[PDB]
Amino acid sequence: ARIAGINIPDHKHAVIALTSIYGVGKTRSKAILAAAGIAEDVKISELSEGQIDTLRDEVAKFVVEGDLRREISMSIKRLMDLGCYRGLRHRRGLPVRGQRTKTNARTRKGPRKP
Amino acid sequence: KLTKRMRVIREKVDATKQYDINEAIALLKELATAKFVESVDVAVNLGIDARKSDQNVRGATVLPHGTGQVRYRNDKNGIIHTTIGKVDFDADKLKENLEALLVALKKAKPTQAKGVYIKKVSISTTMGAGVAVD
RNA sequence: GGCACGUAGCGCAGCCUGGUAGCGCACCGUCAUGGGGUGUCGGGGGUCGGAGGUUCAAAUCCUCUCGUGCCGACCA
RNA sequence: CCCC
RNA sequence: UGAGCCUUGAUGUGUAGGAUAGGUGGGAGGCUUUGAAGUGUGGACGCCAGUCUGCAUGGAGCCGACCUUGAAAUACCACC
Ligand SMILES: [Mg+2]
Ligand SMILES: [Mg+2]
Ligand SMILES: [Mg+2]
DSSP states (O other), X not given: OOTTTTOOOTTOBTTHHHHSSTTOOHHHHHHHHHHHXXXXXXXXXXXXXXXXXXXXXXXXGSOOHHHHHHHHHHHHHHHXXXXXXXXXXXXXXXXXXXXXXXXXXXXXXXXXXO | OOOHHHHHHHTTOOSSSOOOHHHHTTSTTTSOOOSSOOEEEEEEEEOSOOOSGGGOOOEEEEOSSXXXXXXXXXXXXXXXXXXXXXXXXXXXXXXXXXXXXXXXXXXXXXXXXXSOSEEEEEEOOTTSOOOEEO
């Protein structure tokens, strides 16, 4: 309801709110509720704050919103520093997940201009 | 079609006969048929074409007997809704309250007027057949 | 003075008759065909000649202006 | 509709 | 037989939202038995969504304020 400072995962199950949290995904929520000692069958609207602060303390061990994009940007600045092919391609605003580029990258390369 | 009320008040005035000032303050007892302090409206028909931005009117009336400081403004087509007061407020004083209204307007007569400024003064009642005086 | 034209490259509706730039031709990429066209299918392409005001908002109301027309008027 |  | 015109008849979907509501806008009691609201239906307009009138059965009952609307009710009255 308040975790992470900004995100309100209201009416989300205990681990579903953590999968929907900004920074982590599918298994880290399970890992958090296992390291904290909570089950995942009820929404966030039933667990009191006596444990929500503990969930927020336990998630303070990973990279969070403010450092997530900034570690990504540190890597991207390493790309703008080196000059390698993934810096060249990334410095032209091109799609994001592999190697094939010629015929089918149209969603993230945008529709055809002319 | 109607009750006894509305018909005898329409059969107490004349629209084809444009009444006069001194003739006007005799009939507002026959034009008043409400059980309270009912009002009497005035309409001023004007003689300019207001379709132009330059011809807006705006001012306040210093009432010679109070009601009382009321603002006014003309219409875009040439008929402004004003008021003299009520029907029981000394009908004979209502003519003297008609006096002070219009002499303040010709003093602030706009210079960008086209043709005659005024056209007609309808001293009408809120619950009866109107009266259109020259 | 007096009224009629400006709307995509072109021709126009709408017009210079009130709320939401549309039609046709032109152009680009498909589909249609054994090969083509007409044709259907999408996409760009203009902010209503300019400006200024009325609006709950103009294009569609009003004033000035610009270019082009036509009638008429014009004895430093 | 055009054409081989 | 057009034009101008007094009276009367009668008029101008926006969406919002009780609401075919023009610029104002004075305005809260009209309404009612020189013979109700609902209805019985002939007629009118119609983007027919609704305004709405003749004789009435019913025969004396609704509403302005009362809430959401760029607007309030055209309840009366006002000149177009
Ligand atoms: Mg790419
Ligand atoms: Mg000459
Ligand atoms: Mg052959």
